[model samples]
Target chain A: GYTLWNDQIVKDEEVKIDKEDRGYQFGDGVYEVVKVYNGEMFTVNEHIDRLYASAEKIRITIPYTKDKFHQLLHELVEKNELNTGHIYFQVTRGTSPRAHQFPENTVKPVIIGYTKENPRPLENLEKGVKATFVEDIRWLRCDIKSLNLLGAVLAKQEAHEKGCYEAILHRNNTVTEGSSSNVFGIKDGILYTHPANNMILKGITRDVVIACANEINMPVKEIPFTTHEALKMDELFVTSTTSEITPVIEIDGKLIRDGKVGEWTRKLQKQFETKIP
Target chain B: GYTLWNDQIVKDEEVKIDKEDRGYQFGDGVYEVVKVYNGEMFTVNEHIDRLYASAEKIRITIPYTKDKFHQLLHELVEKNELNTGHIYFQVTRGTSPRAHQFPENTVKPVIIGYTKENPRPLENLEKGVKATFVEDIRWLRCDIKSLNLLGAVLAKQEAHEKGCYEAILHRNNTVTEGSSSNVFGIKDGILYTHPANNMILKGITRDVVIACANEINMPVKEIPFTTHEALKMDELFVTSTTSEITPVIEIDGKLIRDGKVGEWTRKLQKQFETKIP
Candidate 1:
């Protein structure tokens, strides 16, 4: 498989990350995962915009125009023949002497990316998956999709250990979002999700789902909801680039309304499928 | 120069980190920096123990024993001919196909260490340095010396931009600790620091300072203090492996009681110097 190393696409083994890379030592980087469908990237421009935004938030100059970056991703996908997968890439503050402060301008930002083959989760989408509640202990700047992601990793691990598909994170009884996805709850034929704030990432798929909801005339409310409210929700679902729109049938061992996918969720999934290549 | 890659000492350039390394991608790692004086590591055991504790907290089983880890640090220092420097090492959960959950046991943890020439900040310790107050917007598990350090990096960068030496972080008006060190304040002849809890890292130098205070019959209180109270302190200092007991003579452009190192701070520094080889 080919890997994207800075401005060039090369053999995966040719990419050698330095030990002093700030991403390795301090998790000082930002990343984006763009889903590929039928040899074309879905929402590629949005992902690229978020990547630049995240890098700018941490004062990292990407050194590449958006057109050039988009071309690189396309080249990587074509070289690897990635038809249905994710194009994962990250830009670190780069390598220098180990210190808490940013490195000198001489140290250029390191960019590495590779394509992974991942088929759509058809079964999970058709039926539903279970989830568990985990406390949201991540940093305040969760809005930036930075490399400081141990908090998300640990929460996901806990959910996996409990045989759950997702970890719905909450801050003091107020539900935030999934460890790796944006969550939405349906009650009285209305869609509710946490507002895009410092506590949650403004997910590309999440925005698409909201658009889908609006088109279908399903009223969407961007407001905070409590875990207690989540438990009583008529329907629950999560959205991410990879997950798309996966229904949540059970949470914390309790089945959501007879442990079946909700009708409104199925409608949103149908609307979401239209956006794919 | 030589670098420690797992159990072997290799040339610095020979260490090639994988692009998929959990440390680089997800910040799933723990690290430590042990100060070396005259080729001997200071508080080696304490650092090793803490590293193990941090790994265990995140469910990463380090492959090497404490004794072996200590020997590796010594070997790295000797191989590099390091003197008056730092022995920095970190253990990552290792490389795998990018995923949130822990990789399989077959993926051995990646350990990397290298020696850097960093002379003691004797000038800062003698004349003291200015600091700025930054909000503590880090995760809850600040106690873990993990690679998820972008929070510290951002805060320290803010202080650097303001022409300050350190960033003293506070949460809701209550001071927690420095960006990369533990903070202390003195009032009415008593030393005050935040209790060793989730709010702060259990700094090795902090423990040594508390012990030094006990030996000199100075009252030490491990309690929380606010930034408002910190400005009124008669003495202030920060402790870290690199900084040692450097005094904070000014904060936020305001002089800390005439902008001079305090008598109690000088006494602690004298005591700290005795412990160095």
Candidate 2:
């Protein structure tokens, strides 16, 4: 299932985003990433909740009501069958002529949603992945998930060039998260991750991981961790909707936890998967 | 000549400005507007000079040499018969994983271009137009001509919805320019406009207007004029590459200078068009 544009399944080729579109021109927009499972939309409620929060953070209002968006998404999933991937969606502050200001009474928001297929990331989870740490230069509203993503793009490119999958961004030497994924690490047999702060996107997968840890009787702490401690952890993994529990095999070319996927990572991957229908 | 995906004339619809593309995502790109005539790039040298200038202002390095860009643009002009239009060329920071920092050395910068028609704006310029004054809320770098254009969007929407063609954006009561064009007024029979500052984009058309005035022995004064005084002038007009000497007929719903195009405006329009060849 690809993007639902004007009630049709469109490929990347057909969409025309104007240069003067406010989202690209000024970063005046918000977005959400959710999953579509077997003809069903998953975590839709949570996604809507986060979307509204993002809009509020930026003082924007979604053009359609939550129920309307929900209906549209579910219908789109139904129209495009056999979904086992993620539903990527975004709403931009629409086009205005080239100037920099909160338009007084202009530009309707533009909404877009697309789906990508990924039958499983379990193989990658088992094989583990590589990562690197970069300085976090994002504004103090990571929870909003706005369209302004210059710093993140820079870091991610560095990771890819270095044969790494994720850029584990840090603010003041404290680990935040990956460039496009949430991050988690196990240190001294305990599960640790970043606390809710302005520096990180509150990942839906992150919360799920914590709940899974709770179910498995493992102690989970949402305290911030230093990069030094993070690198020294017994195990590390990314927790995006895709790449669930994908272990961090190397960081800056240094092996992470002997460069092998750890026991806890496997357990969480299976435990988290069982939660879905 | 549409865009070289490894050198191909692909349709604009078939293009994939990747999800992580800095241009599509952050508008982190620089562009040039070059006039083309009879399969020849007119003012090709000046376009290159200013294209490099804009790239320098945004600190985005050109992926290709000036010679390379000029050659590509040369081939592109022949590929499409723009006939009487302008060519739009851009170099964007390419896609990578999302981040705020400049992507470090992985993906190559993407080069893209398109051509469109241009003519002396007939309706607004001939009949004259009305504009509403909106306070300038843009950042301090309006001179850069970057892609960020939300401020212009808002103002244009306001004017369009209220039965006007332009928004005469201002710093308080002083007129800067129309929402998408430069503003000039004939005060006591002398051409007056805002001095070059960080208030508006340096209009290519504005440059020609000054040159035309110099040739005709009309003393052009580069001084800021208030909207109140502008309405009382002999003639008020706006300019752009597409719109040359569009006379102002109304301001804030009030008739401007008896609601008739003045003799100076008629003369200025003829002079501006004469420079096109």
Q: Which CAPRI category fits model 1?
A: high
Give the alpha-carbon lDDT of every model.
0.93, 0.74
The number of the candidate with the highest lDDT is: 1
Q: Which ten residues in a row are the worst by lDDT in model 2 chain A?
A: A97-106
TM-score (second chain) of model 2:
0.90
Candidate 2 lDDT tens digits, B1-277 = 2543423556655665555567756667666667665555656777677777776765577767878777777667666756777776666767776444566666787776777766545777778887788776554556766554445655676777788778888877888987778999896669998887777777777888888888777899999989788878878888865565788888877887689898888877778667666
**TM-score between candidate 1 and the true structure:** 0.99
- lDDT by residue (tens digit), candidate 2, A52-114: 888776667776778888877876676666469777677776666544445545567767776
lDDT of 1: 0.93
Q: DockQ for each of the predicted structures, in order?
A: 0.95, 0.15
Candidate 1 local lDDT, A1-277, one digit each (tens): 9998999989988889999899999999999999999898999999999999999999999999999999999899989999898999999998898889987898889999999999999999999999999999999999999999999999999999999999999999999999999999999899999999999999999999999999999998999999989989999999999999999999998988878999899899999889899
Cα misplacement distance, residue B20 of candidate 2 (Å): 1.5
